[PDB]
């Protein structure tokens, strides 16, 4: 029986991974069905081209899905939902994808944020929502068109559980057969906080200083380090453990380079942790 994957939101992230999956589904003989939920002009341009176009430095291709629509109920239940929209509050996003959720369904949010999976697990079984994060420089740049500014991508995902499940191994094999650099680590929480801390510090620092990161390194290293230590202290408080050489590990990656801020301030409120730099930064350019 065919494995069925839906992609909800076809911007850079959903469009790129949805395109790679659709290529594989086309090259195989109904072992895989790939559906896309897209809307408006994007939806209309895809239907007219008969597919989604992806351009990268080295590639230029048209991926044709099994099904593309603005209506999840037309898709029906699937095995995997890749949740890739930034457009809805979580209440609304869950309501809209429900027609695709059946018995076997596993949902992968690939969005930035500290706690997207937790949020989505509010109204769904824990077993249904996995955690994921991507490293990819991809943009919907025109109706029906995704542009990658670099070919490189990383896709991490997992249940969090101590031993990988059948549905997980199945997804991992299936993602890598589609040529995606998929990794299914057991410590998926670590990849998730690691991603969020980097983009939290980087987003807040370049947004307050109105400067690129390499100019932040040279002139604002104390401040940058204050942010690194703060976010690290926050996480070290709530997820109990949270590595070390972690501040340093994060720090060095910066050299080779709005609730990425609000979340942090409020989470420390709750874990009774003072974070002066984040608080100065959040408050004084919410202005």
Question: With helix as H, strand as E and coil as C, how does 89-105 read?
Answer: CHHHHHHHHHHHEEEEE
> Please, what is the angle between helix 246-256 and helix 221-238, to 10°?
140
Q: How far apart are CA 184 and CA 159, in angstroms?
A: 9
Breaks in the chain after residues (C–N exceeding 2.5 Å):
257
Q: What is the C-alpha separation between 21 and 101, in angstroms, rounded?
A: 19
In three-state secondary structure terms, 218 is: helix
- Cα–Cα–Cα angle for 219, 221, 222, nearest 5°? 120
C-alpha 35/C-alpha 81 separation (Å) is: 9
Q: Which two tokens stand for residue 87?
A: 């457009």
Angle between helix 188-209 and helix 276-283 axes, rounded to 10 deg: 50
Distance of alpha carbon 264 from alpha carbon 73, whole angstroms:
36
Query: CA-to-CA distance for 194 and 202, rounded, in angstroms?
Result: 12
Euclidean distance between CA atoms 118 and 189, whole angstroms? 11
Distance (Å, rounded) from C-alpha 117 to C-alpha 129? 6
Output the CA–CA distances (angstroms, integers) from residue 39 to 10, 16, 45, 85, 172, in the order listed: 9, 16, 10, 11, 28
**Distance, C-alpha 173 to centroid of its chain:** 19
Q: What's the angle, vertex CA 92, arms to CA 87 and CA 97, rounded to 5?
A: 90
Distances (CA, A) of 8 to 82, 124, 143, 199, 251: 6, 17, 16, 23, 34
CA distances from 278 to 83, 114, 192, 229 (A): 29, 16, 20, 10
Which tokens hold the place of 281?
């930064």
Contacts of 220 (CB under 8 A, 6+ apart): 205, 209, 211
Q: How far apart are CA 211 and CA 153, in angstroms?
A: 26
DSSP state of 285: T
Count of alpha carbons within 13 Å of 94, Cβ hemisphere only? 15
Q: Which two tokens stand for residue 197?
A: 């801390």
* Direct distance between the N- and C-terminal alpha carbons of the chain, in angstroms, rounded to an integer: 55
Method: X-ray
**How far, in Å, CA of 204 to CA of 43, rounded?**
33
Q: Say what angle helices 188-209 and 262-270 make with each other, to 10 degrees.
A: 120
Taking the C-alpha atoms of residue 140 and residue 148, their distance in angstroms, rounded to an integer, is 9
CA-to-CA distance for 189 and 157, rounded, in angstroms?
9
- Distance from C-alpha of 176 to C-alpha of 51, rounded to nearest angstrom: 22
> How many residues are there in the chain?
287
What domains does the chain contain, in order, with CATH numbers?
1-186 (3.40.50.720), 187-287 (1.10.1040.10)
**From CA 132, how far away is CA 227, in angstroms rounded?**
24
């Amino acid at each position: 029986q065919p494995i069925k994957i839906a992609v909800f939101g076809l911007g850079g992230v959903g469009g790129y991974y949805g395109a790679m999956l659709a290529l594989r589904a086309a090259a195989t003989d109904g072992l895989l069905e790939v559906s896309w939920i897209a809307r408006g002009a994007h939806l209309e341009a895809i239907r007219a081209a008969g597919g989604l176009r992806v351009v990268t430095p080295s590639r230029d291709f048209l991926a044709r899905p099994t099904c593309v629509t603005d209506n999840p109920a037309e898709v029906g239940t699937v095995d995997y939902i890749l949740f890739c929209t930034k457009d809805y509050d979580m209440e609304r996003g869950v309501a809209e994808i429900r027609p695709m959720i059946g018995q076997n369904t596993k949902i992968l949010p690939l969005l930035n944020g500290a706690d997207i999976a937790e949020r989505m697990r509010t109204y769904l079984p824990d077993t249904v929502v996995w955690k994921g994060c991507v490293y990819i420089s991809a943009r919907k740049s025109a109706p029906g068109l995704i542009t990658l500014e670099a070919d490189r991508e990383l896709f991490y995902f997992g249940s969090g559980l101590p031993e990988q499940t059948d549905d997980e191994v199945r997804l991992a094999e299936l993602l890598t057969a589609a040529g995606i650099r998929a990794y299914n680590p057991t410590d998926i929480d670590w990849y998730i906080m690691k991603k969020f801390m980097m983009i939290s510090v980087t987003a807040t620092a370049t947004a307050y200083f109105d400067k690129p990161i390499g100019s932040i390194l040279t002139e604002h290293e104390p401040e940058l380090l204050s942010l690194l230590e703060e976010v690290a202290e926050l996480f070290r408080a709530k997820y109990g453990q949270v590595p070390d050489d972690v501040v340093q590990q994060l720090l060095d990656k910066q050299r080779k380079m709005e609730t990425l801020t609000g979340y942090v301030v409020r989470e420390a409120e709750a874990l009774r942790v003072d974070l002066p730099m984040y608080k100065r930064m959040y408050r004084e350019l919410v202005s």
